Write a protein that holds these residues in place. Structure first.
Motif, PDB file in Angstrom:
ATOM      1  N   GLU I  17       0.819  -1.208   0.000  1.00 12.55           N
ATOM      2  CA  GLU I  17       0.000   0.000   0.000  1.00 12.55           C
ATOM      3  C   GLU I  17       0.856   1.262   0.000  1.00 12.55           C
ATOM      4  OE1 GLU I  17      -3.629   0.380  -0.176  1.00 12.55           O
ATOM      5  OE2 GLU I  17      -2.979  -1.494  -1.105  1.00 12.55           O
ATOM      6  N   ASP I  18       1.945   1.268   0.771  1.00 12.99           N
ATOM      7  CA  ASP I  18       2.853   2.409   0.729  1.00 12.99           C
ATOM      8  C   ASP I  18       3.461   2.578  -0.658  1.00 12.99           C
ATOM      9  OD1 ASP I  18       4.297   4.587   1.958  1.00 12.99           O
ATOM     10  OD2 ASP I  18       6.070   3.303   1.893  1.00 12.99           O
ATOM     11  N   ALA I  19       3.868   1.473  -1.285  1.00  9.27           N
ATOM     12  CA  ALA I  19       4.430   1.547  -2.628  1.00  9.27           C
ATOM     13  C   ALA I  19       3.410   2.066  -3.629  1.00  9.27           C
ATOM     14  CB  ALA I  19       4.950   0.177  -3.053  1.00  9.27           C
ATOM     15  N   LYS I  21       1.005   4.156  -2.921  1.00  8.32           N
ATOM     16  CA  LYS I  21       0.917   5.594  -2.677  1.00  8.32           C
ATOM     17  C   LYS I  21       2.119   6.338  -3.243  1.00  8.32           C
ATOM     18  CE  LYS I  21      -0.123   5.897   1.840  1.00  8.32           C
ATOM     19  NZ  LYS I  21      -0.646   4.624   2.410  1.00  8.32           N
ATOM     20  N   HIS I  22       3.264   5.668  -3.361  1.00  9.41           N
ATOM     21  CA  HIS I  22       4.466   6.294  -3.898  1.00  9.41           C
ATOM     22  C   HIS I  22       4.487   6.359  -5.420  1.00  9.41           C
ATOM     23  CE1 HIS I  22       7.065   7.334  -0.581  1.00  9.41           C
ATOM     24  NE2 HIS I  22       6.822   6.181   0.011  1.00  9.41           N
ATOM     25  N   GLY I  23       3.634   5.612  -6.105  1.00  7.12           N
ATOM     26  CA  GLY I  23       3.583   5.644  -7.549  1.00  7.12           C
ATOM     27  C   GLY I  23       4.141   4.440  -8.276  1.00  7.12           C
ATOM     28  N   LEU I  58      11.897  -0.864  -5.512  1.00  7.90           N
ATOM     29  CA  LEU I  58      10.998  -0.456  -6.584  1.00  7.90           C
ATOM     30  C   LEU I  58      10.437   0.937  -6.348  1.00  7.90           C
ATOM     31  CD1 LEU I  58       8.801  -3.449  -7.688  1.00  7.90           C
ATOM     32  CD2 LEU I  58      10.720  -2.414  -8.864  1.00  7.90           C
ATOM     33  N   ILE I  59      10.170   1.298  -5.093  1.00  5.65           N
ATOM     34  CA  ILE I  59       9.747   2.665  -4.793  1.00  5.65           C
ATOM     35  C   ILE I  59      10.802   3.650  -5.269  1.00  5.65           C
ATOM     36  CG2 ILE I  59       9.564   4.292  -2.894  1.00  5.65           C
ATOM     37  CD1 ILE I  59       7.941   2.109  -1.419  1.00  5.65           C
ATOM     38  N   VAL I  60      12.064   3.369  -4.944  1.00 15.30           N
ATOM     39  CA  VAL I  60      13.152   4.263  -5.347  1.00 15.30           C
ATOM     40  C   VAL I  60      13.225   4.370  -6.869  1.00 15.30           C
ATOM     41  CG1 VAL I  60      15.655   4.209  -5.611  1.00 15.30           C
ATOM     42  CG2 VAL I  60      14.642   4.295  -3.339  1.00 15.30           C
TER      43      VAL I  60
ATOM     44  N   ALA K 121      10.896   9.011  10.270  1.00 13.80           N
ATOM     45  CA  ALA K 121      10.378   7.685  10.583  1.00 13.80           C
ATOM     46  C   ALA K 121       9.865   6.983   9.336  1.00 13.80           C
ATOM     47  CB  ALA K 121       9.278   7.783  11.635  1.00 13.80           C
ATOM     48  N   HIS K 122       9.185   7.717   8.451  1.00  8.63           N
ATOM     49  CA  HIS K 122       8.754   7.117   7.194  1.00  8.63           C
ATOM     50  C   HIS K 122       9.946   6.673   6.359  1.00  8.63           C
ATOM     51  CE1 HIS K 122       6.021   5.992   4.126  1.00  8.63           C
ATOM     52  NE2 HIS K 122       6.408   6.915   3.267  1.00  8.63           N
ATOM     53  N   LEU K 123      10.997   7.490   6.304  1.00 11.12           N
ATOM     54  CA  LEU K 123      12.177   7.116   5.532  1.00 11.12           C
ATOM     55  C   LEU K 123      12.855   5.882   6.110  1.00 11.12           C
ATOM     56  CD1 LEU K 123      13.665  10.588   4.720  1.00 11.12           C
ATOM     57  CD2 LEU K 123      13.008   8.876   3.068  1.00 11.12           C
ATOM     58  N   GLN K 125      11.327   3.541   7.709  1.00  9.15           N
ATOM     59  CA  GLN K 125      10.452   2.422   7.382  1.00  9.15           C
ATOM     60  C   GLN K 125      10.702   1.899   5.974  1.00  9.15           C
ATOM     61  OE1 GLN K 125       5.847   1.870   8.641  1.00  9.15           O
ATOM     62  NE2 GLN K 125       6.244   2.998   6.744  1.00  9.15           N
ATOM     63  N   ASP K 126      11.079   2.774   5.045  1.00  5.06           N
ATOM     64  CA  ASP K 126      11.306   2.416   3.655  1.00  5.06           C
ATOM     65  C   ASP K 126      12.749   2.020   3.382  1.00  5.06           C
ATOM     66  OD1 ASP K 126       8.682   2.902   3.178  1.00  5.06           O
ATOM     67  OD2 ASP K 126       8.973   4.753   2.041  1.00  5.06           O
ATOM     68  N   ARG K 127      13.544   1.807   4.428  1.00  4.84           N
ATOM     69  CA  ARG K 127      14.956   1.440   4.312  1.00  4.84           C
ATOM     70  C   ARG K 127      15.730   2.438   3.457  1.00  4.84           C
ATOM     71  NH1 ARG K 127      12.333  -3.344   5.211  1.00  4.84           N
ATOM     72  NH2 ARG K 127      10.754  -2.394   6.564  1.00  4.84           N
TER      73      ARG K 127
HETATM   74 ZN   LIG Z   1       7.024   4.976   1.734  1.00  2.00          ZN
END
Ligand SMILES: [Zn+2]
Ligand SMILES: [Zn+2]
Ligand SMILES: [Zn+2]
Ligand SMILES: [Zn+2]
Ligand SMILES: [Zn+2]
Ligand SMILES: [Zn+2]
Ligand SMILES: [Zn+2]
Ligand SMILES: [Zn+2]
Ligand SMILES: [Zn+2]
Ligand SMILES: [Zn+2]
Ligand SMILES: [Zn+2]
Ligand SMILES: [Zn+2]
Ligand SMILES: [Zn+2]
Ligand SMILES: [Zn+2]
Ligand SMILES: [Zn+2]
Ligand SMILES: [Zn+2]
Ligand SMILES: [Zn+2]
Ligand SMILES: [Zn+2]
Lengths: 170, 170, 170, 170, 170, 170, 170, 170, 170, 170, 170
Positions: I17-19, I21-23, I58-60, K121-123, K125-127
């Motif tokens: 879900e976070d991914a 939201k990130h696109g 993949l988010i990055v 904290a979000h960052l 969480q995303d490693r």
């Molecule tokens: Zn994130």
């Protein structure tokens, strides 16, 4: 090398037992022994032998009759300086102990000795050498005043003024 | 690695057989062998080599003529310390065994050896190193007193006094 | 890391094959190879390279002409010492192998070499370093007497006396 | 630490690609690359950088024109020595490679270079440092003889004699 | 999953056929094959792998020339140990098979091999690891004695004495 | 969990399809696919991963040009070793495949590759690691000999001699 | 100690941000940051601080105006050398950066700087110190010629010949 | 050695508490304490004692009255240089602190002190010793001008020009 | 423990879900989510956290602007590598994703990124680490070339040639 | 390894029985024994030896005369910290027990010991090392004040003030 | 071992009850307690103890006065990171909690704390460690700016700008 660690631990324990036989207060010895055994577990030779030097200096001071407050401050400062492996500061501390022992044997009043000794030991613990050297000169001056016949009240007053000058920074 | 476990088990068995050929008492070897095989099952190398060290120290002590009670206490303490993988405590135990062996070879009376050895082995088992080191100094003093010609009664009295001093905590 | 285990296994196998080409007896190589492959399975580097050092020392000894009995005792002791990762004891064993090789090349009688070598290797296996060092001094002395022209009977007698002194503990 | 393992793998691969660009033969590089990736998988830094040193030395040797037989023997010896983390033996090997490169550049005949280089690399592989040092002296002598104008036949004969003397043990 | 059971059955049958082609006696293979197929019907992976290991060790032993009585005892012990999924005892059994194969190739008399092998296999079957390890040491000693030129009768006598010592419990 | 079984089955099928697109022969892929699906039905993760590793190594070998008989023997050995979850033996097999691929790319004669590869794969299948490592050394020597300009007939003769030495047990 | 790892990571990140504020190109900082975080994950102090030294040198070079090609080559060589923990080679690289910065500030033509800098950085990457020192002397000589009024064409020609001489080996 | 780690942590905490009693701002002490406990967890002696030196220097500076901006920059630089174990850079930092303390006690305007102190601390953080030494000379010059009676405006202007010259690189 | 399975399922769903939201494209997320839930059903911790690492990478990459085709290939490779619990190959894949993100942010042409990324992801999928590392070097070289001002056509040509070399095996 | 579990269980039981013989209260030993047996079931070595260390420290504290409330808090904290496998926090706890034992032997009032010991044990349980170290300094100060002759009321007041400052956070 | 599961469950429950007594909000404790019990059911020691560390950090933050939104984000990130057994990321999260606690105690406006803390904290969480470390530098800068007397509006503006820079990726 665990055999070397055992050798260092035995050196510390033997020095502590000899000092205890000589009349050194037991609480100071407990602090020094804990620090020494901690340092011997990791085979730190220079620190352990600096602690042994501090123990012998304490033997001298305790035989002379140096008051306990100065001895406590000096013991703490010496443990931290032995952790430093700072031979120069340790030598300055040992010279301070020797001067305080001479002052105590000479009959200098206890209040002046406590004042100047505590101040100088704190200055040595803070790595402030020139002010500590000034306080060493103050101790020598006090001993000469006592040998000259100056009364105790004037000696205490002079020690107070010189110590407050050292603390203030003037 | 089951091959490594087999290698360690063979090392333990070879050490025990050699010790038996040297004359070490069989019950102590039974204790060490059971503990060592249990540790080899899980491939605990360091504990196994500490147990081999204890076996070799027992060979030395049995050749010297150390009394059996001290050897029993030492074997139990050594098994417990090899379980902890405590190299420094094991080294102190081996040094104690060597000192007791020298005392036995020098002719120090059996009562003094038993007293000091049992006390020091118990202190080492309780992870009390400074008191154990003081008792090691006591063993050295007994050996020198025997070499000086002090009678056996005085040696026994001195050993009793120092051991009770350490045990009481003074 | 299975690739590292394979690398160590190949190192052991290459060393053993070169030693076989050099003329080392095959049974000693069989013991070393079994122990080395067992240790390589668990990726024990230091033990494996200690075993490779033992193999090279055996190459030297076999080239010199050291008798087989001493070689067997040395191989067993060296395997057990490589298990312990005892670099100091392994170095003492290699120095013993070198002294025995020099004695063999110098023409010292086989009986003396076997006597002193077996005794010293056994002592090194039992963690008795001072006595092993005394026996190493004995080997050097035998080499010098052989170079001086002392007859073989006297060399054998001297080796027997010194080895019995080391065993007896005198 | 898998990131460190990736860094070490990238170091090995970059060194191998640079050496390939410099003209080092590919089979030696394949051997070194396999060993290096195996060691990088387990995060063995010192071994990996020793292998990188060996790769650079091979670059120098290939540029000079050292014959392939000596290079093969040297590569195998160097991989095994890097496994041991033997910095002294690796430095002796690199010094040998430098002498062989100077000899090849100076015009010393190929047969002499192959003979002395193979013998010295084998001796270094067997941890025989004094004999390897004698053979290094032999290489230096060959270079000076070539610079002095001695014909190739006498250089070959001298190299053969000295190598046979080293192998025989005289 | 019966597909996994079929895979295990095919593994057992392939191993048995290869061992037959290598020269392993057929009755032993019949026992192992029956046990393996029974264990494969219920999808016991570890037991079947242990049985395949036992088959390969039998290939080695039959190539060396180990006598048949020892082979029968070893096969029965190996089946019953594979039933327990006892990896350590199976490894000890395979090490025993390797030692007996070395003894058989080395020319050790058949009587000594049969005596020690049957005793050690029975001890491993009764879950007596320390005594089995002592008997493994006996096998190694037999091989070294054969290599040293000791006559066959003395080897047989020594094997008998050591085996009766192990059986008697001494 | 049958979702994990489906995941493993899809992994096997994807690996087989990629290998087919790379040019790997189809009968080997059929063998591996049948074994992999049978192992995935019971959720055996490690065995399936070992089979995928074998597929990828076959991709490398088929790209290089390794002959088909060696490939068949290697595939059968790899399936049997993946059934045992033998990571060390599988790694040895992958190392053998890599060495044979290098030999095939370097132009080593087909007969030599077939001989040494079939022998080494059979030895790995019989859990004979030392002889397999000796044969790996033989493959490396063949590659170096081809790079040095040795004729094909001499390479074939040398491979025949070394492989027959491996089989015979010398 | 993960707190030490966090400290090292913060050191790397702070140095990178400061360099970015100073105007260092971002791609080089990306390589250095990736390497530094990888080395800080495993608590490698010396390598991380060598990377910080490289970052500060790059700050100096970017302020001077050193061309980007030499900077890229220098950054890659420096990352590999910090992996080596090679303090001497890192010192040589930093002194090369200092000389190149002086040459850039002095108005030496860009082509000559690129030529000599790339050559010397590659030589330092290959652990070839004497040739790198010769090229450092070349850089100093170029700076002096620029200060003497020599035209740009002559400087470029001289740099080309000296770099070709170093590369060729003359 | 976790006892040594406890000793180092106690040293750091004692220094921080003494500094807080002396009047050092608490945020700087929080930074230094966090870094010191991180370094003591891994038993880094030299770094911890460098941090203690920085704490004592901060005590001196806070007593003198050095402005907070320079103190923050100096604290960050000192933490990073203690991570370096860079004794020389730490000594330069402490000398800078002493000069700024003398300037503050001498009545040098706050703006000039902030300018030169921030510039010099940044230059020390970037490992640029010569420019930092020039800025130290600037501080001494400012103190002498203040003692000579030069008004505040020209002192501020002179500090601005000298700092701009240092930053620009002229 | 199905509570742990629920925890893993919630971790996968939160990451997906976070991914989203990130696109990150939804289809890649669908593949990863299906694999993650299947692995969570059987309580596979390491594989699930490897998949979460892949999602974050993949988010990055999606933030940077990596082309979709490379993203699809990378996602499939990552799922199959997370099934293997291969931390080293997953780390290599994440390093590749980071390099591709840097190339995409720097403006490297889409064709070059697609070519090199698809090739390197396929090589990592087939367990071919050396060639994948060479392609990582190619990506870094492309980023530096873009930063140096090389035209897009030359960058595309260089990427094509290097990738074709990697495929061909040269 | 169930034999290792039995060994650890026997270690725990022996330690608890010795502690009962020394006079440690039975409820604390019941808590430690239950936790230790639970950890021995799963073969957790390090936690079990940490619990043995806690038992020995309790022997020392109970011999000294430490109040029971502080002992209960310390025992609970030590059990949770042995579950942590936190050697550093456990060592800090043991140092606290030693300081409290010294304070109890020196005659420090029970109220001060209870206050400071409970606060420091709670802080150590909550992983707050710096505040715990400050409280350790407070304990040392109390011991020195008792040795100096300060009345009990002043000691209680000082301990209350310092503990209130630590709890409040000042 | 379900006894170890009970021990871990009791550890979690004791930590949660202590944190409740300290004033931590109950919903965060509910999340952590559910996750901790789920992990304790499967005997996951490392994850449970990472959760206990998170609870203690929450105690510190809630005592300081950190806003609730940041606490919620931190708690969720910490639970996910403890599931990963990510000690480095957990330590980065705890150090972030400490910096935010210092900022809250120093009076930094709530808006700035919420902005920077939620982003970091979000960052974490995303490693994304480098960007998280940059934001940690931002937090330290905010604390120093508050200590210097900068008005709240400028602190909020600077925090907003730096956080937007981090999110945007600049
Ligand atoms: Zn994130
Ligand atoms: Zn004395
Ligand atoms: Zn013996
Ligand atoms: Zn003595
Ligand atoms: Zn050789
Ligand atoms: Zn001599
Ligand atoms: Zn190069
Ligand atoms: Zn076969
Ligand atoms: Zn043998
Ligand atoms: Zn493919
Ligand atoms: Zn080769
Ligand atoms: Zn800067
Ligand atoms: Zn102070
Ligand atoms: Zn780059
Ligand atoms: Zn007791
Ligand atoms: Zn004290
Ligand atoms: Zn609490
Ligand atoms: Zn700060």
């Amino acid at each position: 090398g665990t055999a070397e660690a055992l050798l260092l631990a035995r050196a510390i324990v033997s020095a502590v037992e000899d000092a205890k036989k000589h009349g050194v207060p037991e609480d100071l010895l407990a602090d020094i022994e804990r620090a020494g055994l901690a340092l011997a577990e990791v085979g730190d030779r220079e620190a352990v032998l600096l602690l042994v030097r501090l123990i012998n200096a304490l033997i001298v001071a305790a035989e002379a009759g140096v008051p306990k407050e100065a001895l406590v401050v000096i013991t703490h400062a010496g443990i931290l300086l032995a952790l430093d492996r700072d031979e120069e500061a340790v030598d300055a501390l040992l010279e301070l102990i020797d001067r305080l022992a001479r002052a105590a044997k000479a009959g200098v009043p206890k209040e002046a000795i406590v004042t100047v000794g505590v101040a100088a030991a704190h200055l040595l613990q803070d790595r402030d050498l020139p002010r500590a050297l000034r306080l060493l000169e103050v101790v020598d001056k006090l001993v000469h005043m006592k040998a000259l016949g100056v009364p105790d009240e004037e000696i205490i007053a002079y020690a107070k003024e010189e110590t407050e000058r050292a603390y203030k920074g003037e």
